[PDB]
Every structure is written in structure tokens, then in C-alpha cells.
């Protein structure tokens, strides 16, 4: 029924490890950039 049963699950292994390195990396990248905005602080000073 499924010849590809073994390849497939080995692939799953390599796709899980890889993704366990890219999800955490790329999240970092996302905080690298965003940091500017999330760290930002405001101040409102009317002449009024």
C-alpha cells in the first residue's frame, strides 16, 4: 500500500530537526528587527 513508508519517516526526521533549528533562528531574526518598535517609548508634549 505504501512503498514510501520508510523514506517518508526518515524524511520526517530530517524535517523535524531542521525545523527545530529554523523556527528558533527565524524567530530571533523577527525580534532582531521588531525590537526597535517593541522597545520604543512615547512622549506627548503639547504647547498647550
Amino acid at each position: 500500500a505504501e512503498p514510501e513508508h520508510d523514506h517518508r519517516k526518515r524524511m520526517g526526521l530530517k524535517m523535524l530537526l531542521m525545523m527545530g533549528l529554523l523556527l528558533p533562528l527565524v524567530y530571533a531574526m523577527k525580534r532582531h528587527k521588531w525590537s526597535v518598535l517593541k522597545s520604543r517609548k512615547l512622549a506627548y508634549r503639547p504647547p498647550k
Binding site: 518598535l37 517593541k38 520604543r40 512615547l42 506627548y44 503639547p46 498647550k48
Partner: protein
């Protein structure tokens, strides 16, 4: 004949008010309306203080929605202070429109 019933809506109103979280975000009802054609004109008629003030508060609140953080309990809009400051401005805008519509029947 509303004495009991309409002196108690203030309680659901009050319950509702803080239930809708804008409360928490530093925002005020007026600053939550849907920005459409009538509302726009209205906004365009706000005096500089009034109007710079809405800009700051949406600037504060969107800031917060970006960061998913609520303002301090100390610093939150209190229902008792319902500045319906747009209402005045908004009404006429509408009032002028309806007239303009009405004058256009025949």
C-alpha cells in the same frame, strides 16, 4: 416613568463599559467610532487640542495593541468621565446631511 429601570441601566452600561476592553487601552468611546464620511467631517472640525489629543490616544492604544500589553490599573478611562466631545461635532455633520438629503426630495 423611568426611575427604577433607567437608574439601573447605568449599572449594565457601567458593566458593559469596562467589559469592552477599550477602557483598559487608554482609549475613550469617541475614539472608537467607525471612521466614515460623517465621522471624518466631524473629526475635521475638532479644535487643535481636542483633535491632537485623539491622535495621541490612538497612538498610545495602537502602540499597546501592537505589544499586547494593557495600561496600568491607575491610568484607565473611568466611565464617569465620558467626554462625548465628538458627539457635538458629529451631530451637526449628520444634521446638515439629513437636511441636504431632505431638501433633495422635491
Amino acid at each position: 416613568a423611568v426611575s427604577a429601570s433607567s437608574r439601573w441601566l447605568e449599572g449594565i452600561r457601567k458593566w458593559y463599559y469596562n467589559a469592552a476592553g477599550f477602557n483598559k487601552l487608554g482609549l475613550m468611546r469617541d475614539d472608537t467610532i467607525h471612521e466614515n464620511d460623517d465621522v471624518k467631517e466631524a473629526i475635521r472640525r475638532l479644535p487643535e487640542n481636542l483633535y491632537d489629543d485623539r491622535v495621541f490616544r490612538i497612538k498610545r492604544a495602537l502602540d499597546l495593541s501592537m505589544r499586547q500589553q494593557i495600561l496600568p490599573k491607575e491610568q484607565w478611562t473611568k466611565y464617569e468621565e465620558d467626554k462625548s466631545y465628538l458627539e457635538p461635532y458629529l451631530k451637526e455633520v449628520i444634521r446638515e446631511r439629513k437636511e441636504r438629503e431632505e431638501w433633495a426630495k422635491k
